[PDB]
């Protein structure tokens, strides 16, 4: 990475960019012949929002998500983890990443709270307005229990 | 007329009541009722829901052995799920052959 600073001198100003410590991965990829990281480490269907150790690696300090071209992820996976970090962002698991400056607990929330409207009336069983949980993207995760994931309550 | 068909209600009510009792004592020991009876019939013990419930009332030490007997069969069954054959069968999963 590189850090840029804009310094303040009297009647002048200087902009300069310096290189910082470049982290790296471990020297033992478990699964070679993998183009994306989930295939190189076998995390294709065995991750979620709660295991935030890898999610912190695919974000910015303010809370911005990295691009696919520089990270090198699949299209299906790139849209998966950008969802999972949004679940973690709304859940409040990364309080140090509050973006830039000059009330209630919450978790497992697909959409944003402000934009979502209430349901003043729920229809009958055959037209019940059931609320959503998670997303259709992470449905492919292996379910250790026998019954499947209930995405809509 | 209500006295006649109430017998089938007496059967269903008392039957389902025993399910709640055995489901309760199992949860106290750390198991659930569907897995419980599955291990019992797998381990060849034909104890109906009356005595199975009533046993939990007066000797929880015995019902703990039934639960411990049941939980061990689950691990034997899961070990069988990993490898069906090609292994030594479970010691308690061994069956008696009548003829």
């Amino acid at each position: 990475f590189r850090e840029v600073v804009e310094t303040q001198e009297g009647k002048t100003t200087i902009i300069e960019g310096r290189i910082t410590a470049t982290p790296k991965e471990s020297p033992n990829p478990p699964n070679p012949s993998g183009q994306c990281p989930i295939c190189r480490w076998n995390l294709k269907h065995k991750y979620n929002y709660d295991d935030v150790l890898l999610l912190s690696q695919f974000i910015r300090p303010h809370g911005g998500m990295l691009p696919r071209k520089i990270t090198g992820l699949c299209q299906e996976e790139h849209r998966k983890i950008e969802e999972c970090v949004k679940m973690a962002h709304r859940a409040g698991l990364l309080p140090n990443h509050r973006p830039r400056l000059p009330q209630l607990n919450r978790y497992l929330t697909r959409w944003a709270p402000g934009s979502v409207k209430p349901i003043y009336k729920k229809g009958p069983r055959w037209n019940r307005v059931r609320m959503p949980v998670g997303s259709p993207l992470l449905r492919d995760n292996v379910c250790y229990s026998r019954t499947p994931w209930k995405l809509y309550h | 007329v209500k006295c006649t068909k109430a017998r089938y209600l007496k059967k269903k009510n008392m039957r389902t009541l025993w399910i709640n009792r055995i489901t309760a004592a199992s949860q106290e020991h750390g198991l659930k009722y569907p897995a419980l009876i599955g291990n019992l019939v797998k381990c060849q013990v034909e104890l109906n829901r009356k005595v199975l419930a009533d046993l939990a009332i007066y000797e929880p030490k015995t019902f703990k052995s039934l639960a411990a007997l049941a939980s061990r069969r689950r691990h034997e069954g899961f070990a069988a799920a990993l490898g069906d054959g090609k292994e030594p069968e479970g010691i308690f999963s061994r069956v008696v052959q009548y003829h």
Binding site: K121, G123, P124, W126, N127 | -
Partner: protein, 43 residues
């Protein structure tokens, strides 16, 4: 709210009943043993 026209099981519009995996698992068991039957009463 949520009523339906007339009776619940007949007519131009009725309650739309839907399937459960229980009933699916039940009926496949009945026709797969019938496939076991189909093998045996042959030959």
């Amino acid at each position: 709210r949520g009523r339906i026209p007339g009776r619940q099981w007949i007519g131009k519009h009725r309650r739309p009943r839907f399937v459960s995996l229980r009933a699916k698992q039940n009926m496949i068991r009945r026709l797969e043993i019938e496939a076991e039957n189909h093998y045996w009463l042959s030959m």
